[PDB]
Write a protein that binds this DNA or RNA. Structure first.
Lengths: 200, 460, 118, 101, 102, 51, 50
DNA sequence: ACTAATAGATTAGAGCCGTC
RNA sequence: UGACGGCUCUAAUCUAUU
């Protein structure tokens, strides 16, 4: 049980989750998100159950105006409410309130009672309180290593953002001169061309 | 066109990524500092500019495109250091004293006195008061810069007061005696949201850049506190960079009188500068030429212990025999020295026939073993957008004197494209030794009464 | 205003933009006729705007929508507009002397590029 | 518009009172919502109860008992209702019904 | 000596009696600040370098020379260096102020 | 003759706060006299001295 | 078939009707059409197994 | 003597924009 | 001067010939 499952809106909480997960991977945790894997597909559903029921030890849910009332997040949250139950871990769902536009009175029932981790005012203190909460609860973790986050950054978020060995042809602004006149002739006009003739 | 690979810049815990914005946003700076003491001055209104938006900087400032404009999580999250509304030594500069000072019709004395009005307040504060200010923060209003500036122009709508010239360089140069780094802000660099300068649109800035606009503002206000955000790794040891640009000292008499502020970047990750000599054409005579190397190259003796094996002196100006021969017998013996002139001499632009985006940066066109080009400006694979919106031009890099592998040379200039501790950009289109020597060349020429050792960047 | 399906002179608000070239012949690296790309603006298509700052401002805001292709087709068409007969362009030095110059800009080859990720 | 009088209770422990309540309550005219005979079956229980509590609930009538106070599902209703009560600024939003003797 | 002392006052140290010579829980627990072996700016002035200036016997000249060895480094680091120091700790050995005293 | 004054007076141009220290005041433990009893008995003061 | 006239999805919630890929494939197809048909009473997982 | 040169090919200032 | 571009505009100078 090592995965830290993050539930969030797919295209909206990406900025925070990309920060948060890669911080969580940077701090050494193992996180499932829909943006930390490629070659997805059948991975969505029928494997999320296995990664939650057998691999997810903490459920860090992103609370925001976008994650509120979303079919994917609510469904994953409903799983988190159930998965909290068979194991004796009441502190398995940990909410994360990020959006300023989402008031604290518009929080969904699955996490109303759960002590959320504040991120609206400052993401740094929320990240720290994330660390202290895991240390107090003896959450399983490995040594801190941000290279894994960098690896997750370069492999996933920099996948189609690199160079490829490909032959290209570039046009320029240079027109090469093909051939020249055969002889450059110095015409010896001793006092024969006018002195101030302005030969231009 | 052999392609020169994009270099790397280190970050926290010795890690190595490729983007200054992305790496810091996720990894952090190398050295660990605790907090930053912000000695802040300015007008009473300007206090309501810096104070509140300073709180925005540690809030997450979003980007519309995290690819082109990388993430910005905050200030303690990214820099691992605390910035708060403490240490705010707000030396309230009344607008009435500025009012009797700003509208003077003089050219230099208007700036000389107005800078002095700001100078004498900050100076006593770091002398007598009780703050450990590290980044002095002088918020300057808008009307002063609009009027008081190079070739200052003042309209005649409210004429009431009557009687280098730049506000910024004079401000920075005077503090070399007092040795205090300082950050100076103008117009709506902070108050762009509510400025609506011309009409309702914030013509100065936008929300798209705001993600990395606060990157540049924070990283400019972070390096001066003794931190080391990012340092190079691909630059080898025993290699000396002398990025020097000849700077005209006067604007009225002696057009051939000039001085050079030769930067000197070290192999141990030290973005050091050096003081050159005032050489009166457009060349460093052996009297001044000997002094430069015998002083700038001397720092390797005590900073490391021995003279660098290679000495890559950079310039935007070609040499002649007199300068180079002086550079041999003055000090360098058994140690290589190479003079490389980097300039946008002739426009050689490349255009991609198939596809619509411009040439990718990192292309080197050979002309000779001692001459080639370097496309340090153009498309970036990571951010998926060219650094230059327009069709770029390469840096004509030819080895003026000495013999060296220019391909080894070319990737080395590309290596010095990310030490740009004044903005948060993927890469700077000029070597740091040559880009940062122009401003310091402008600082050391603001006044003629400075005895400056090899001072670091943060005062400039 | 088209040369081989390439628009060389067009419209921008109230200012008509014109593609222009500046040629500087060099013997380095090899004998070439180096070309530069500029945009110049005319109020009615016949008289240039006599304001350097305005022309600078207009050129900065006219290249705003111009990408690499928009630059290259305009340059090559204008350069190929100077082609003499089929593949060159002669510079006349005398009654019999001519200097044929290629109409097609020098091609270069690169083995590293991006994948065009739209 | 909040006109449904949502009454909170735990399990079928109360349900035989709550319809007896309802058959008098919806019998007299109060719009009564219960998680037994008014809950949308085949849909989310968790999302629906929040949706009525957050938006559709006019009054919160919790039943108190030895089996209707310590249950997490019931406690979930009170906190969101209290937050909605904070939004409504009405202390009497939550009205405990002391049903069990 | 500092590598012993500097982090010694972070941890609490008990004297013979706390009533007359009270202990302190530590720098972090008392003064609410971070002050540890970090940001150290060790600038070695070697004894041979010191001795090459200490061996002079003219106290009217040697005593000025000994300080001149110290200040030139401090102002250099203040101006022509990158490292930031808040309070400088000149640990002059007992021998330096044993001879250069009135 | 004591360098205390000249050292601190010469930094007035630089205005850097330097805490002049000494080995005896900072190395009480390892400093030992000939007879085996150190002259400076800073052990008990290692409270309010460290203050 | 599912897009045309699937109506409700009264699933046998047996102890072995969840790991099968076929029932999940119907469920996965049901999940996509549920958003396509903007329905919420679509799935009725009849819990039959004791 | 260099007085003027008209081109080479460098060489900073320096305002002006565009938005990485 | 948060800045990095890009060009644009001036001026000066070394190098040879009226």
């Amino acid at each position: 049980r090592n995965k830290i499952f993050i539930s969030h809106a797919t295209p909206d909480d990406n900025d925070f989750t990309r920060w948060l997960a890669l911080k969580l991977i940077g701090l050494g945790y193992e996180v499932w998100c829909d943006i930390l894997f490629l070659d997805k597909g059948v991975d969505f559903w029928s494997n999320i159950e296995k990664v939650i029921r057998e691999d997810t030890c903490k459920f860090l849910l992103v609370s925001s105006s976008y994650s509120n009332q979303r079919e994917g997040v609510l469904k994953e949250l409903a799983v988190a409410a159930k998965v909290k139950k068979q194991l004796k871990d009441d502190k398995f769902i940990i909410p994360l309130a990020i959006d300023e536009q989402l008031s604290y009175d518009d929080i969904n029932i699955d996490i109303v009672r759960l002590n959320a981790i504040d991120f609206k005012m400052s993401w740094a203190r929320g990240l720290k309180d994330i660390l202290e909460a895991f240390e107090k609860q003896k959450v399983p973790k490995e040594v801190a290593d941000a290279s894994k986050s960098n690896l997750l950054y370069q492999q996933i978020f920099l996948h189609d953002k690199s160079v490829i060995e490909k032959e290209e042809i570039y046009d320029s602004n240079w027109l090469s001169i093909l051939s020249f006149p055969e002889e450059l002739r110095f015409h010896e006009y001793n006092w024969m061309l006018p002195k101030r003739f302005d030969v231009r | 066109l052999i392609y020169i690979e994009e270099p790397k810049i280190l970050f926290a815990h010795g890690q190595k990524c490729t983007d200054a914005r992305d790496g810091l946003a996720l990894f952090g700076p190398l050295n660990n500092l605790y907090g930053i003491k912000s000695g802040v001055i300015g007008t009473k209104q300007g206090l309501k500019i810096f104070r509140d938006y300073l709180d925005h900087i540690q809030k997450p400032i979003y980007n519309s495109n995290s690819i082109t404009r990388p993430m910005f999580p905050g200030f303690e999250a990214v820099f691992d250091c605390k910035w708060e509304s403490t240490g705010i030594t707000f030396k309230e500069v009344t607008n009435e004293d500025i009012g009797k000072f700003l509208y003077n019709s003089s050219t230099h004395k208007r700036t000389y006195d107005l800078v002095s009005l700001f100078i004498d307040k900050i100076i006593s504060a770091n002398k007598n008061e009780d703050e450990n200010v590290d980044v002095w923060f002088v918020i300057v209003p808008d009307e002063i810069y609009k009027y008081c500036r190079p070739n200052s122009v003042l309209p005649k709508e409210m004429v009431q007061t009557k009687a280098d010239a730049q506000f910024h360089d004079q401000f920075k140069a005077r503090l070399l005696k007092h040795t205090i780094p300082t950050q100076i802000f103008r117009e709506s660099t902070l108050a762009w949201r509510d400025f609506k300068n011309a009409f309702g649109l914030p013509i100065r800035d936008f929300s798209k850049i705001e993600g990395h606009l606060a990157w540049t503002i924070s990283t400019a206000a972070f390096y001066k506190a003794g931190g080391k955000p990012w340092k190079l790794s691909d630059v080898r040891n025993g290699v000396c960079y002398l990025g020097l640009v000849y700077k005209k000292v006067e604007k009225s008499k002696n057009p051939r009188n000039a001085c050079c502020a030769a930067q000197m970047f070290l192999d141990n990750g030290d973005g050091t500068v050096f003081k050159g000599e005032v050489g009166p054409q457009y060349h460093l005579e052996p009297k001044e030429a000997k002094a430069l190397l015998s002083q700038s190259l001397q720092s390797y003796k005590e900073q490391i212990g021995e003279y660098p094996k290679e000495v890559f002196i950079h310039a935007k100006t070609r040499f002649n025999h007199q300068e180079w021969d002086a550079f041999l017998e003055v000090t360098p013996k058994e140690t290589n020295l190479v003079g490389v002139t980097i300039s946008k001499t002739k426009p050689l632009k490349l255009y991609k026939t198939e596809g619509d985006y411009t040439i990718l940066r990192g292309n080197a066109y050979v002309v000779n073993e001692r001459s080639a080009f370097l496309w340090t400006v153009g498309y970036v694979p990571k951010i998926q957008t060219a650094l230059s919106m327009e069709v770029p031009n390469p840096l004509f890099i030819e080895i003026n004197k000495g013999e060296a592998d220019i391909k080894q040379v070319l990737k080395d200039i590309l290596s010095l494209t990310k030490l740009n501790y004044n903005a948060c950009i993927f890469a700077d289109g000029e070597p740091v030794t040559l880009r940062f020597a122009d401003k310091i060349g402008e600082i050391l020429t603001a006044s003629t009464d400075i005895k400056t050792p090899p001072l670091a960047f943060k005062y400039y | 205003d088209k040369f081989e399906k390439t628009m060389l002179v067009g419209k921008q608000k109230d200012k008509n933009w014109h593609f222009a070239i500046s040629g500087a012949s060099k013997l380095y690296p090899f004998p070439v006729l180096m070309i530069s790309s500029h945009i110049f603006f005319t109020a009615d298509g016949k008289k240039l705007i006599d304001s350097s700052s305005v022309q600078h401002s207009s050129r900065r805001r006219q290249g705003k929508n111009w990408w690499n292709n928009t630059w290259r087709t305009k340059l090559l068409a204008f350069i190929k507009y100077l082609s003499d007969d089929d593949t060159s362009f002669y510079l006349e030095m005398g009654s019999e002397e001519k200097v044929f110059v290629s109409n097609e800009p020098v091609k270069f080859k690169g083995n590293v590029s991006y994948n065009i990720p739209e | 518009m909040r006109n449904k009088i949502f009454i909170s209770h735990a399990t079928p422990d109360d349900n035989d009172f709550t319809r007896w309540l309802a058959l008098k309550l919806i019998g007299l005219g109060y719009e009564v919502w219960c998680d037994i005979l008014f809950l949308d079956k085949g849909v989310d229980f968790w999302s629906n109860i929040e949706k009525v509590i957050r938006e559709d609930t006019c009054k919160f009538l919790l039943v108190s008992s030895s089996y209707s106070n310590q249950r997490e599902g019931v406690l979930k209703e009170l906190a969101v209702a209290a937050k909605v009560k904070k939004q409504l600024k009405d202390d009497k939003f939550i009205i405990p019904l002391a049903i069990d003797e």
